[PDB]
Design a binder for this molecule. Structure first.
Ligand SMILES: O=c1ccn([C@@H]2O[C@H](COP(=O)(O)OP(=O)(O)O[C@H]3O[C@H](CO)[C@@H](O)[C@H](O)[C@H]3O)[C@@H](O)[C@H]2O)c(=O)[nH]1
Length: 585
């Protein structure tokens, strides 16, 4: 595509004052023909960048200057207060008329919802060498985050549910491999891969090179998802196809928060009840948390009010700098974003999916402009909220219980550090434990009589903290459908006759109704995979066996001839699946 002539032009352009990328061409021949393969190839990806980024490498460099300049000054907003449109979600564990009404309205709206999963990130912190969505939500069934989201979306939206996954060079091939291995058949799935952007070796925005002498690249953030969608087709633009098909909402989720399946229906219901074009999923924030804050903002004294997320790392500078004339003053945003499709599309087309950018260089010294590592420009998918003026649109937030936010983000080591400071662990152990506890709270909400200790059953991270797992109850999507309280009531139509001991394990797959059961041990019950089949009904069942246990992974573990995997080690315990009764048919 790129002619040898065009390449020389770009080379010369990049050497001009204000771009100053002469260091890339040190020791090069005057003209292209004279240049070799290595050289001609470097000039190429510089050139091709145009097709990946607005205004190519030249504009990228200019944006860097503008950002690096802005990044020296203290952030400040003329005004900062509570967003006008904030709404409290009813508890997920109380079956009130309101909760019922909202779940019913929301669950119906799921039939007309487009789903989007951002799964391009590496999650540096974890100490898991594979992709985040390949993590199990829990080790009872080992269902991956990927499968969990997809089966749920196909359940509430039908097999043909529109679904977008954003990958990156870091996650893409493994994502496709996982889809293939799980034998997930998702007809309207679109996998969209974000491209990498160049890096700056310094505050003057000189491009960094790697060891071999090639242009160093890094991801541009979860912000890329909007442009990826804008430019995606199916002949016809993707979003057009969705609109023409009758879809009315679009939802964005992140890679390791199982809570989203619970919050989303509620949000949809509230978005429609309160006519919200954009609806931020929130929780009460603890002053220290690495989650952003939902605020009403005016950056300068003359600007309009803008409802938008302010990231945690920024709310620090703004904190002390801006004021004069148990939780954070403003809601914490968990980045489950709920949009009215038509409103979303309008702003998308206006901006070409392009959202405001930033840069957050890491310095090697206190106050030397020297970079410890090359920096690149970033973007946040939630910053699309900046394109929604208060005049034309209604942006707001829905506040849920903190318990419904269950990310898996920190390693065991970090988690011990956080917990010693009294902060949330948000690690694999607490993620799995939170999942089990969520099923239990939901089930008790429909009257299932679960009695169980609140004491931890295992300690992790060198006696730092403990979690409990039991009793373990996991119902698959065929069994539990959307997971609404009404849907759970269908599995247990007479919950007072179902007695699950605190040490028990109940796994249910397919079309199953449990009327009466006494369980002291582990039990798997399987019904027809076909959701429209005659359900396997369980009455007067009595099951007793050794069941399962959990124990900690000990420091004195050889790791040799041990089937202990990273998945085990990052949570610090292992389930022992000693006995299991199985009821089929
Ligand atoms: O280049 C990227 C970077 C990230 N991601 C994904 O984006 C999501 C969010 O990434 P994560 O690294 O977990 O957290 P932060 O980006 O630090 O923060 C976000 O997530 C928080 C809650 O988990 C919110 O409170 C913040 O405001 C929101 O910016 C994940 O699913 C990642 O896979 C990509 O797809 N491409």
């Amino acid at each position: 595509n790129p002619s040898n002539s065009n390449l020389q032009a770009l080379r010369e352009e990049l050497c001009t004052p204000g771009l100053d990328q002469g260091h890339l061409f040190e020791g090069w021949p005057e003209t292209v023909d004279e240049c070799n393969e290595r050289q001609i190839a470097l000039l190429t990806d510089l050139y091709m960048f145009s097709n990946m980024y607005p205004g190519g490498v030249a504009q990228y460099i200019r944006n860097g200057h503008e950002l690096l300049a802005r990044e020296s000054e203290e952030v400040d907003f003329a005004a900062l207060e509570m967003p006008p449109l904030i709404f409290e979600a009813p508890s997920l564990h109380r079956r009130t008329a309101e909760r019922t009404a909202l779940e019913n309205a929301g669950t119906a709206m799921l039939c007309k919802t487009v789903f989007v999963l951002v799964a391009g990130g590496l999650g540096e912190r974890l100490g898991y060498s594979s992709i985040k969505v390949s993590l199990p939500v829990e080790t009872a069934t080992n269902t991956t985050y990927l499968a969990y989201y997809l089966r749920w979306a196909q359940r509430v939206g039908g097999k043909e549910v529109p679904f977008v996954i954003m990958t990156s060079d870091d996650t893409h091939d493994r994502t496709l491999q996982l889809l293939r291995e799980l034998q997930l058949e998702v007809p309207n799935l679109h996998v969209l891969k974000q491209g990498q952007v160049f890096c700056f070796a310094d505050s003057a925005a000189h491009l960094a090179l790697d060891e071999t002498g090639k242009l160093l690249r890094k991801p541009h953030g979860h912000g890329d998802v909007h442009s990826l969608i804008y430019n995606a087709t199916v002949a016809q633009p993707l979003v057009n196809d969705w609109l023409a098909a009758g879809y009315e909402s679009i939802v964005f989720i992140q890679d390791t928060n199982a809570g989203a399946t619970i919050t989303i229906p509620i949000s949809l219901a509230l978005s429609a009840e309160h006519s919200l074009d954009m609806n931020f999923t929130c929780i009460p924030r603890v002053p220290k948390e690495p989650i952003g804050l939902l605020c009403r903002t005016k950056k300068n004294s003359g600007d309009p009010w803008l409802v938008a997320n302010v990231e945690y790392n920024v709310f620090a500078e703004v904190s002390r700098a801006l004021n004069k004339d148990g939780f954070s003053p403003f809601p914490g945003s968990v980045n489950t974003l709920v949009f009215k499709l038509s409103s979303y599309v309008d702003r998308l087309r206006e901006s070409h999916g392009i959202v405001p950018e930033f840069i957050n260089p890491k310095y090697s010294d206190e106050t030397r402009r020297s970079f410890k590592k090359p920096a690149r420009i970033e973007s946040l998918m939630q910053d699309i909220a900046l394109l929604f003026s208060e005049d034309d649109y209604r942006v707001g937030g829905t506040v849920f219980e903190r318990f419904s936010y269950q990310p898996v983000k920190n390693s065991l080591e970090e988690a011990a550090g956080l917990v010693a400071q009294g902060n949330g662990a948000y690690c694999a152990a607490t993620g799995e434990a939170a999942f089990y506890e969520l099923q239990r709270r939901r089930l008790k909400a429909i009257g299932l009589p679960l009695f169980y200790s609140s004491q931890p059953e295992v300690t992790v991270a060198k006696d730092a903290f403990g979690v409990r797992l039991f009793p373990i109850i996991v119902l698959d999507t065929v069994c539990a459908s959307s997971g609404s309280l009404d849907d759970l009531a269908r599995v247990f139509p007479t919950p007072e006759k179902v007695h699950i001991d605190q040490h028990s394990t109940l796994i249910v797959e397919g079309r199953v109704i449990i009327e009466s059961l006494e369980l002291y041990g582990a039990l798997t019950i399987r019904g027809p995979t076909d959701s429209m089949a005659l359900p396997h009904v369980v009455r007067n069942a009595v099951v007793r066996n050794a069941g399962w246990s959990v124990h900690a992974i000990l420091s004195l573990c050889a790791g040799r001839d041990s089937r202990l995997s990273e998945v085990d080690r990052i949570r610090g315990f292992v389930l022992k699946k000693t006995a299991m009764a199985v009821m089929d048919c």
